[PDB]
Every structure is written in structure tokens, then in C-alpha cells.
């Protein structure tokens, strides 16, 4: 019996400021999929990381309405519990709250304002964003703030630009993120969004799935654990099996039971081998209902594989869509000019360049899984090389930094306020790092 | 005493497309075979295509192809195609974990 | 007490970052599903105008289609192979003791939240 307590511990010093700055230098925000970070362009690493959450916290002895938005939630647990994200689903439903978030970020940057904003901005758009949300973002960043430089871009494609700085590389980009998982094919550094696909399942849905299975495994439990406790035991106690099918027969079981079968303990106050239900529920050791800790204890690992393995079979999550393997197979073989039987040359170098990223892809065992299934459907003898990032959430920020180092690419990606005033909000610059047109 | 080579193609029938090219009598057939180490594609004469038709082979079946003798033996439907119906007479067999093309002397 | 730390940091956050004469436009507040319906109506209006150019969309054409391979079946309560499904309950179950221990004495209304994981409720 090895027990783990899951309560969140965080009480840092307050986030701060950098007064020394250049007003003409661009600034980068990396919303992306994980919705967590920002920083100055000239630095190699992001300066600040925010939880993307807002707390209304009335202060006593002077009763006014107060915003405790952002990283202040990490300081106090009650302020953390009061917090909620601006995003409703795939997109933010609270635009003035986003304005408050952005102004908090600008103050934490340490810039001295000039008119609206004196500096160019780097912005990550969500893939294939809705036109009304495009207009909403335009009226956020240009009419409200008079900005010299505005860019639109996709975070996983920024990741591809980060690990392919030349900008003329074929490749296949997968992104497993907090909200959704997308597949995007890239040809000569220009991604094709007509052939791109995505699944609505994301990391947040995975933690919700774990919470649902956890509500089902013990309907009667003395303690209600928080969302972030579920997040911690998801990021610490879920790994990808090499293949689901044989590993669900022997569910780390018989001999491998009581070697890796971890029991999860709450924060505060006929044979056992014969019953399969008892082995699933209370583990290998005999259950003692009298112990208050063991009544508060909970046996996990029973299926810690199901939670990452929903992305390959999305019908387990209720969504009637194909998985990562099937979409990657039909992109690599059926589409992009490859007749069924050989890979086209673009498809060959797509196989040679495959990147796993997102920041929700830090679950162990994903690389070997995707390599084995890529070997499964491809012709024999084709070399498969899949590249993995050390911090997969951090790739898009370095990507827009590396584009900002590329002066002609940056000049081709800036939208200024005069174009938004003239062609209106229907128009977008067709970057290789941007969304295509809506119709046709 | 005779020396001999045995060449075996094995795996799941991914694709099966007979080209007729009438001038009834098919010209040839293209056959794709899938294993755990990858897949291949094969070009076959119409006689072994008819012998394939006499083992009731469809897409998803696992077959035995010998290069020289040209003998065909079906093994059963694939494990990935098990849940098309809840219970069916077709024997379900896993994929060959080796390569498709095996040779021995 | 306790309020000094939070009071001080909130003093640092709250006072510049805006253009002349702009404020909250008190716009209508909608949830996300509302935005999907309005966007769907928008390209619907565009295509009905075009019908009276080629059909293409962004948020709906990146939707992953359903798979052609039949998906693996799993038990609803345990998660192994669902060899069997109960006729009355429509619940996938693994074996006999699972059936008589969970599927039979299940308290009603739990079968829909069982199927809600697979979205068959």
C-alpha cells in the first residue's frame, strides 16, 4: 500500500515587471491551445506564464468591485477556486474580460503606453476560427488599441516553423492540446488547411472523462475532489500503452498486480482474486471496509490507459469521428497525390518530418505508439522519423519569435490598421502560417 | 537431392482490384498485403486470382501466398474487423507480426 | 485580517492600454453554441446566395469524418471486452459476476449516464 495525497500546493511570490523596454520592438502573446503564456520577442524564453483565469475578489474594509485576474490566483487557494477561464468552449465568450486580461499582461510587461499600444503584437489564432470571432478579434486588437503590428497564426504551425526555420519544408503536423486535437499537412513550408482535419477531443475533455469514470467507479465516496486534483493525477498517473488490445487482456494483472497498482488516498478525513469486480474495484489486496483511510483510499491504474487512448478511438469518448491514426493514414496515403500503392515524394518527406506537439502531448508513450501505427499502414522500407519537443507547449512561442527574426516573412504577415479599415474585417492576409479563405 | 527456395507473402488483404482489359477474362489483379512490419503490393496472373476467388477471399482476410508454386490458403478475417457484427461464423485471426515477404531455402 | 497581502498585490495590478474614446460597447453576450449557429447560418446564407463559388468552409470542413473501420467494443462498467450486452439495460458487460453484481441491481437512471460516456443516451 503506497498512498498519495493530491491537494494542490502553490503560494509563490507575486508576478512582476520589467521597466526597461523598447516601444518599437514587437511583443508576443502565445494563447495557442494551452492558453498559458506570453513574453518579449527578443528574449529566447517566454517571460510570463498565466493560468488564463479571472477572479472577482471583493476586498473588505474598502468595498469596491475588484479584479484579481491572472497569476494572482496562484497565490491564494480561495482566489484560485473563485477563478474561471475566459474561454467557454473552443472560443472566449467574455471579450471585456479578455481586454482586462490583456491589459494586465501589458502592465506586467512593463511597457509605457503610447496611444493605444506602441508595439507590434504576435497573436496565435485557433485553427479555422469562426468569421464572427475573427471580427471580434479585429475589433479587440485594432479599434480598441491602435497597434503598429498585428499577426495571425496557428500555434502548431508556429511549432513547425520553430523546428523548421527555413520555411520551405514538407511535413505532417499533429497537435494534441487542451481543447482539441488537429491534423495539418504541410507542403514546402506552406500548410494546407483544405486537407486538414481535427477532433473535438482535448485535454480538458480527457480530465472530464477521468472525472466521469471516477464518479462511476465509486458512487458513494466521502470526499469530493477538485478539478485540479483530477488534473494532477491525470498528468502524473496516465501513460500510453504500446498497443491497447493485448494490454487490456492482462490489465497489469496477476503477477503485475501489486507491482504497479497505485492506491489514491483522499486529502483528509468469495476470494479477493476470484471476483473480477473486486480486483477492478479494490485491487489485489483484501478490502477492509472499516479503515477510514481505506474508505478514503481509491485504487487507480485499473484503466489508467483508457484516458490517453481515447484520441485514437474517439467513439469511446462519444464523438463519432476517426482517430489520429486513421486521419494520418488517409492524409499520408489517400490524399496529397499519392496513388494507393506508393508514397508520393511530398508524402515521403511528410513521413520523414512528423512533429508531435501541443503541451497535452507530454503524456508518456505517445511517440512509440504513433511510430508503431505509422509503420502499420505504410509500405515496408519507408523511413519514418517522428520528432518530439522537450516542452511541447513552448514551441509556438519560439515559433513566432523565429518568424519575428525572419524579416521578409514578418513583413508579409503583418496586418496594419489601414488594411482593416479599408478591406474591412472580412479580409485576412494569406500567410503560409495563416488561415485560408472561407468560401472556395 | 534437390535444393529449393520457398518465398512466402503473408498478411491482410488491404486492396483487391482485378483489371479486366477485355479485348470476363481479367488481364491481371493487384493485391495489397498488410502486416505489422508494414505493407506491400503484389501483381498476380489471372489463374492465381481465380484460386484466390476459390478461397472466398475478400478485403480483410489473411492469406498465404507462395511465389513459386502459386498456392493460396486463407487463414481468416482480421482481428481489426471483429466487431462488424457481434457474432459471426468467420474465424478471426491476428495479423502476422513478421514481414509480409519471408524467404527460406 | 489576512487581507494585507491580497490588498497590496491588487493595488499593484489596478491603476492607458486603450485608444482614445473607447470603452465597453455593452454588446450582447452569447455562449459558444450560439456562435456556431450564427456562423452556420452565415455560410448557409453565402451558399444560398451562390446557388441563386465552390463550396468550402473553415470550422466545418476540418471536422473529422467517422471512421470506416468498425470501432472496438468495450465494457461499460469495467472497460474490458464487452462480449455481452444486456437486452433490458443496453449495457456492455464483461462476464457473469459483473452482470449479476452491477448490471442487474443497478439503480434506475444510471444506464443513461452509462451510455453518456459513449453518447448513446
PDB file of C-alpha atoms in Angstrom, chain C:
ATOM      1  CA  UNK C   1      -7.119  40.138   8.937  1.00  0.00           C
ATOM      2  CA  UNK C   2      -5.230  38.192   6.181  1.00  0.00           C
ATOM      3  CA  UNK C   3      -6.235  40.840   3.623  1.00  0.00           C
ATOM      4  CA  UNK C   4      -2.977  42.819   3.552  1.00  0.00           C
ATOM      5  CA  UNK C   5      -1.143  40.635   1.012  1.00  0.00           C
ATOM      6  CA  UNK C   6      -4.047  40.361  -1.453  1.00  0.00           C
ATOM      7  CA  UNK C   7      -4.840  44.053  -0.936  1.00  0.00           C
ATOM      8  CA  UNK C   8      -1.254  45.052  -1.757  1.00  0.00           C
ATOM      9  CA  UNK C   9      -0.935  42.950  -4.918  1.00  0.00           C
ATOM     10  CA  UNK C  10      -4.375  44.105  -6.087  1.00  0.00           C
ATOM     11  CA  UNK C  11      -3.146  47.658  -5.573  1.00  0.00           C
ATOM     12  CA  UNK C  12      -0.209  46.868  -7.867  1.00  0.00           C
ATOM     13  CA  UNK C  13      -2.449  45.396 -10.588  1.00  0.00           C
ATOM     14  CA  UNK C  14      -5.197  48.016 -10.692  1.00  0.00           C
ATOM     15  CA  UNK C  15      -4.310  51.569 -11.679  1.00  0.00           C
ATOM     16  CA  UNK C  16      -3.503  53.688 -20.600  1.00  0.00           C
ATOM     17  CA  UNK C  17      -3.928  50.410 -22.544  1.00  0.00           C
ATOM     18  CA  UNK C  18      -6.708  51.621 -24.921  1.00  0.00           C
ATOM     19  CA  UNK C  19      -7.395  54.035 -27.843  1.00  0.00           C
ATOM     20  CA  UNK C  20      -8.960  57.494 -27.486  1.00  0.00           C
ATOM     21  CA  UNK C  21     -12.658  57.419 -26.502  1.00  0.00           C
ATOM     22  CA  UNK C  22     -13.167  53.645 -26.367  1.00  0.00           C
ATOM     23  CA  UNK C  23     -14.868  51.753 -23.548  1.00  0.00           C
ATOM     24  CA  UNK C  24     -17.171  48.765 -23.127  1.00  0.00           C
ATOM     25  CA  UNK C  25     -19.696  48.698 -26.017  1.00  0.00           C
ATOM     26  CA  UNK C  26     -22.212  46.731 -23.808  1.00  0.00           C
ATOM     27  CA  UNK C  27     -22.650  44.142 -26.559  1.00  0.00           C
ATOM     28  CA  UNK C  28     -24.904  41.096 -26.380  1.00  0.00           C
ATOM     29  CA  UNK C  29     -23.307  38.165 -24.555  1.00  0.00           C
ATOM     30  CA  UNK C  30     -23.638  34.747 -26.203  1.00  0.00           C
ATOM     31  CA  UNK C  31     -22.370  31.251 -25.464  1.00  0.00           C
ATOM     32  CA  UNK C  32     -20.239  29.269 -27.919  1.00  0.00           C
ATOM     33  CA  UNK C  33     -23.045  27.100 -29.368  1.00  0.00           C
ATOM     34  CA  UNK C  34     -24.825  30.339 -30.267  1.00  0.00           C
ATOM     35  CA  UNK C  35     -21.740  31.363 -32.261  1.00  0.00           C
ATOM     36  CA  UNK C  36     -21.686  28.017 -34.090  1.00  0.00           C
ATOM     37  CA  UNK C  37     -25.332  28.521 -35.060  1.00  0.00           C
ATOM     38  CA  UNK C  38     -24.717  32.088 -36.296  1.00  0.00           C
ATOM     39  CA  UNK C  39     -21.664  31.041 -38.306  1.00  0.00           C
ATOM     40  CA  UNK C  40     -23.548  28.068 -39.779  1.00  0.00           C
ATOM     41  CA  UNK C  41     -26.306  30.491 -40.771  1.00  0.00           C
ATOM     42  CA  UNK C  42     -23.670  32.800 -42.279  1.00  0.00           C
ATOM     43  CA  UNK C  43     -22.115  30.311 -44.706  1.00  0.00           C
ATOM     44  CA  UNK C  44     -25.658  28.965 -45.263  1.00  0.00           C
ATOM     45  CA  UNK C  45     -26.649  32.447 -46.456  1.00  0.00           C
ATOM     46  CA  UNK C  46     -23.493  32.599 -48.586  1.00  0.00           C
ATOM     47  CA  UNK C  47     -24.172  29.247 -50.273  1.00  0.00           C
ATOM     48  CA  UNK C  48     -27.849  30.014 -50.860  1.00  0.00           C
ATOM     49  CA  UNK C  49     -26.762  33.279 -52.467  1.00  0.00           C
ATOM     50  CA  UNK C  50     -24.246  31.366 -54.594  1.00  0.00           C
ATOM     51  CA  UNK C  51     -26.858  28.823 -55.702  1.00  0.00           C
ATOM     52  CA  UNK C  52     -29.343  31.544 -56.916  1.00  0.00           C
ATOM     53  CA  UNK C  53     -18.336  29.949 -55.510  1.00  0.00           C
ATOM     54  CA  UNK C  54     -17.373  26.304 -54.990  1.00  0.00           C
ATOM     55  CA  UNK C  55     -18.400  25.031 -51.518  1.00  0.00           C
ATOM     56  CA  UNK C  56     -15.706  25.389 -48.871  1.00  0.00           C
ATOM     57  CA  UNK C  57     -15.813  26.161 -45.143  1.00  0.00           C
ATOM     58  CA  UNK C  58     -13.323  26.515 -42.303  1.00  0.00           C
ATOM     59  CA  UNK C  59     -14.835  25.357 -38.994  1.00  0.00           C
ATOM     60  CA  UNK C  60     -16.985  22.606 -40.500  1.00  0.00           C
ATOM     61  CA  UNK C  61     -14.666  21.200 -43.175  1.00  0.00           C
ATOM     62  CA  UNK C  62     -11.963  20.482 -40.583  1.00  0.00           C
ATOM     63  CA  UNK C  63     -14.416  18.200 -38.789  1.00  0.00           C
ATOM     64  CA  UNK C  64     -13.053  14.669 -38.708  1.00  0.00           C
ATOM     65  CA  UNK C  65     -15.382  12.256 -40.544  1.00  0.00           C
ATOM     66  CA  UNK C  66     -16.481   8.983 -38.913  1.00  0.00           C
ATOM     67  CA  UNK C  67     -14.068   6.091 -39.313  1.00  0.00           C
ATOM     68  CA  UNK C  68     -14.676   3.329 -41.832  1.00  0.00           C
ATOM     69  CA  UNK C  69     -13.134   0.587 -39.676  1.00  0.00           C
ATOM     70  CA  UNK C  70     -15.614  -0.652 -37.037  1.00  0.00           C
ATOM     71  CA  UNK C  71     -14.538   0.554 -33.617  1.00  0.00           C
ATOM     72  CA  UNK C  72     -13.631  -1.743 -30.757  1.00  0.00           C
ATOM     73  CA  UNK C  73     -16.404  -2.623 -28.316  1.00  0.00           C
ATOM     74  CA  UNK C  74     -15.736  -2.246 -24.604  1.00  0.00           C
ATOM     75  CA  UNK C  75     -17.484  -2.967 -21.321  1.00  0.00           C
ATOM     76  CA  UNK C  76     -19.367  -0.004 -19.896  1.00  0.00           C
ATOM     77  CA  UNK C  77     -18.584  -0.513 -16.204  1.00  0.00           C
ATOM     78  CA  UNK C  78     -15.191  -2.251 -16.297  1.00  0.00           C
ATOM     79  CA  UNK C  79     -13.770  -1.412 -19.721  1.00  0.00           C
ATOM     80  CA  UNK C  80     -12.614  -4.820 -20.959  1.00  0.00           C
ATOM     81  CA  UNK C  81     -14.189  -6.527 -23.983  1.00  0.00           C
ATOM     82  CA  UNK C  82     -17.937  -6.315 -23.874  1.00  0.00           C
ATOM     83  CA  UNK C  83     -18.670  -9.832 -25.091  1.00  0.00           C
ATOM     84  CA  UNK C  84     -22.267  -9.353 -23.972  1.00  0.00           C
ATOM     85  CA  UNK C  85     -24.819  -6.549 -23.865  1.00  0.00           C
ATOM     86  CA  UNK C  86     -27.859  -6.773 -21.600  1.00  0.00           C
ATOM     87  CA  UNK C  87     -31.158  -6.646 -23.539  1.00  0.00           C
ATOM     88  CA  UNK C  88     -33.171  -4.697 -20.992  1.00  0.00           C
ATOM     89  CA  UNK C  89     -30.377  -2.383 -19.867  1.00  0.00           C
ATOM     90  CA  UNK C  90     -28.378  -1.936 -23.125  1.00  0.00           C
ATOM     91  CA  UNK C  91     -25.198  -2.203 -21.059  1.00  0.00           C
ATOM     92  CA  UNK C  92     -21.969  -3.824 -22.224  1.00  0.00           C
ATOM     93  CA  UNK C  93     -20.587  -6.173 -19.574  1.00  0.00           C
ATOM     94  CA  UNK C  94     -17.610  -8.490 -19.307  1.00  0.00           C
ATOM     95  CA  UNK C  95     -18.733 -11.667 -17.529  1.00  0.00           C
ATOM     96  CA  UNK C  96     -21.347 -13.214 -15.256  1.00  0.00           C
ATOM     97  CA  UNK C  97     -20.339 -11.821 -11.874  1.00  0.00           C
ATOM     98  CA  UNK C  98     -20.122  -8.331 -13.392  1.00  0.00           C
ATOM     99  CA  UNK C  99     -23.635  -8.875 -14.797  1.00  0.00           C
ATOM    100  CA  UNK C 100     -25.257 -10.080 -11.582  1.00  0.00           C
ATOM    101  CA  UNK C 101     -23.244  -7.741  -9.356  1.00  0.00           C
ATOM    102  CA  UNK C 102     -23.620  -4.451 -11.211  1.00  0.00           C
ATOM    103  CA  UNK C 103     -25.876  -4.720 -14.243  1.00  0.00           C
ATOM    104  CA  UNK C 104     -28.814  -6.389 -12.521  1.00  0.00           C
ATOM    105  CA  UNK C 105     -29.012  -4.412  -9.212  1.00  0.00           C
ATOM    106  CA  UNK C 106     -28.213  -1.035 -10.845  1.00  0.00           C
ATOM    107  CA  UNK C 107     -30.408   1.753  -9.536  1.00  0.00           C
ATOM    108  CA  UNK C 108     -32.539   3.213 -12.359  1.00  0.00           C
ATOM    109  CA  UNK C 109     -31.401   6.295 -14.238  1.00  0.00           C
ATOM    110  CA  UNK C 110     -27.760   5.144 -14.106  1.00  0.00           C
ATOM    111  CA  UNK C 111     -27.933   3.427 -17.522  1.00  0.00           C
ATOM    112  CA  UNK C 112     -28.316   6.764 -19.318  1.00  0.00           C
ATOM    113  CA  UNK C 113     -25.223   8.194 -17.627  1.00  0.00           C
ATOM    114  CA  UNK C 114     -23.505   4.908 -18.511  1.00  0.00           C
ATOM    115  CA  UNK C 115     -24.379   5.435 -22.179  1.00  0.00           C
ATOM    116  CA  UNK C 116     -23.476   9.134 -21.886  1.00  0.00           C
ATOM    117  CA  UNK C 117     -19.789   8.167 -21.918  1.00  0.00           C
ATOM    118  CA  UNK C 118     -20.361   6.554 -25.316  1.00  0.00           C
ATOM    119  CA  UNK C 119     -23.031   9.132 -26.193  1.00  0.00           C
ATOM    120  CA  UNK C 120     -25.833   6.623 -26.759  1.00  0.00           C
ATOM    121  CA  UNK C 121     -28.239   8.010 -24.139  1.00  0.00           C
TER     122      UNK C 121
END
